[PDB]
Amino acid sequence: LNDDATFWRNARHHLVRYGGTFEPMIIERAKGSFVYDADGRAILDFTSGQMSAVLGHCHPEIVSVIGEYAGKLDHLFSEMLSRPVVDLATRLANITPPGLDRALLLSTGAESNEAAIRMAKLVTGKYEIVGFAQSWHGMTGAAASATYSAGRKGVGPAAVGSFAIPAPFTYRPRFERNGAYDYLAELDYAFDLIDRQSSGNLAAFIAEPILSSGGIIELPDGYMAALKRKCEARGMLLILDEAQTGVGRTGTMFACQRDGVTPDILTLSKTLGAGLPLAAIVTSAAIEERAHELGYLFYTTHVSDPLPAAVGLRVLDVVQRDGLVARANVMGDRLRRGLLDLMERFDCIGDVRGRGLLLGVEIVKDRRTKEPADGLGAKITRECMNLGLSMNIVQLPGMGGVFRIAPPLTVSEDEIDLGLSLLGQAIERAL
Ligand SMILES: Cc1ncc(COP(=O)(O)O)c(CN)c1O
Ligand SMILES: [K+]
Ligand code: NA
């Protein structure tokens, strides 16, 4: 059972707490779309772990490649190259949009945003970075300085030149022009304020194509293209953080392919390592050449390590071979219709949004007031777990609690239906 007194005593005595509370269970095994507690109880993993298990837990082909490289080619001096590294780098150049040619293989998402941000500052000779007011890019220095949904207080000054603009949010619009939500005019208004505050050192704008921690906020039609033009006019680079949206989760290989807008630097992580610590940035040949002439440095212990790279290549091989980008649309649509069915039954569901298998459900007290419910939101999440469904709700000021639903891309029809059923039962008993 989950009550092991010795486990919990050691946990309380020896763990640094880092946000949230720990779930009251001991996970002993994981397979496919499920994790199992000490009693052997199956829990449907509707968040793919910490949004990384795109192939589900312990996929046989990942188990296979891991064992193979762990026993043959593992870690190396960082100036030594190997085939998994050049192959993965090449595959990323071939599957990302034209204009993205060279890759750097790292370990974590924050680390990949750090590498991108440093490169932008170096090639522009400038340092101000602009992000969204509801963003999340990581816990490390520069990634945290551009993170506005949380973490800015009690820890001293942010990086010099940190600015934010509001994200375009169609469910809670606050910028009206001629009776309607003019998010493009909101963008122009925001950039004029940025321009006046700036010291003339704008280096880049960093953006999630769908803000996850921020409440599953999807950038609307024409917005990303207009953002890119704001950057081009100011000699700024556009960096797109696809930690959560990359590698097929939203129904295209990369979310930026939907708008057809190619960023100057693309960052990847979670979904690329499928559970393992692998991350990357990809940029153009012109930007990389200039960064190299200027002495670009990002030398770490695990950059270009063969085992992590072999795993990422295998992840891509499987996603491509098994058509998992298409499955995200088929299972994504099945899940979204089920969520809309629940919305028909329960007045507390104020909105169902997102794309592919990155969906959000916002809980509200009043559908006309859109007044947040959240106390209710946490309750539903609690009931879901009791029922064997792992969910995650995010809460930001002026918004209802929002469930972030992101099942493995390998999830089955039966699994989607089980999740939908448990959710409905959780809402019924939370009310
Ligand atoms: C969009 C986004 N970017 C970057 C990160 C940071 O990744 P990591 O925690 O692996 O450093 C996160 C957190 N999952 C994220 O959601
Ligand atoms: K290395
Ligand atoms: Na490319």
Q: Are 218 and 210 in contact (CB under 8 A)?
A: yes
**Class in CATH terms, 27-58+323-431:** alpha beta
Q: Of 218, 244, 327, 351, which one is the catalytic site residue?
A: 244
**What type of residue sits at position 42?**
A
Question: Treating both helix axes as pointing N-terminal to C-terminal, what angle do 324-345 and 413-430 enclose, rounded to 10 degrees?
Answer: 30
Kindly give the distance from the C-alpha atom of residue 138 to the centroid of ligand 1, in angstroms, as a whole number.
5
Q: Indicate if ligand 1 lies below 6 Å from the C-beta of 249.
A: no
Q: How far apart are CA 413 and CA 4, in angstroms?
A: 35
Contact in structure between 324 and 357 (CB atoms under 8 Å) = no
Distance CA 89, CA 103 (A): 5
Angle, CA of 428, 430 and 431, to the nearest 5°: 70
Instruction: Give DSSP secondary structure letters for 35-71.
Output: EEETT--EEEETTHHHHT-TT-BT-HHHHHHHHHHHH
The tokens of 330 are what?
Answer: 């088929």
CA distance linking residue 241 with residue 264, whole number of Å: 11
The ligand that comes nearest to the alpha carbon of residue 404 is 1
Q: Has 244 been annotated as catalytic? A: yes
Q: Where are the domains of the chain?
A: 27-58+323-431, 59-322
The 3-state DSSP class for residue 279 equals strand
- CA separation for the pair 157, 119 (Å, rounded): 22
Ligand 1 touching residue 269 (CB < 6 A): yes
Resolution attained, angstroms: 2.0
Check if 27-58+323-431 and 59-322 are the same fold: no
CA dist 69 and 223 (Å) reads 43
Tell me how far apart the alpha carbons of residues 390 and 406 are, in angstroms, rounded to a whole number: 10
- In Å, the largest CA–CA distance within the chain is 65
CA dist., res. 296 & res. 303, Å (int): 14
Both tokens assigned to 408 = 């493995």
Distance 52 CA to ligand 1 centre (A): 10
What is the Cα 146 distance to its own chain's centre?
15
Give the fold, CATH level 3, of 59-322. Answer: Aspartate Aminotransferase; domain 2 (3.40.640)
Rounded CA-CA distance 383/389 in Å is 9
Asked about 8 being catalytic, the answer comes back as no
CA distance 325 to 314: 15
Nearest bound ligand to CA 90? 3
For the beta carbon of residue 115, count every other beta carbon within 10 angstroms: 25
CA distance 36 to 43: 6
Query: Which experimental approach was used here?
Result: X-ray
Report CA(99)–ligand 3 centroid distance (Å): 6
Do 183 and 175 meet the contact criterion of CB atoms below 8 Å apart?
yes
Angle among Cα 242, 82, 101 to the nearest 5 degrees reads 40
Alpha helices in 234-353 (DSSP H): 256-259, 270-273, 285-293, 306-321, 324-345
What 3-state DSSP class applies to 45? strand
Give me the long-range contacts of 333-341 (CB less than 8 A, separation at least 24).
Answer: 334/413, 334/416, 334/417, 335/359, 335/405, 335/407, 335/416, 335/419, 335/420, 338/416, 338/417, 338/420, 339/405, 339/420, 341/420
Q: Check if the beta carbon of residue 59 is closer than 8 Å to that of residue 65.
A: no
Residue 135 token pair: 């963003």
C-alpha 308/C-alpha 66 separation (Å) is 8
User: Is residue 245 within 6 Å of ligand 1 at its C-beta?
Assistant: no
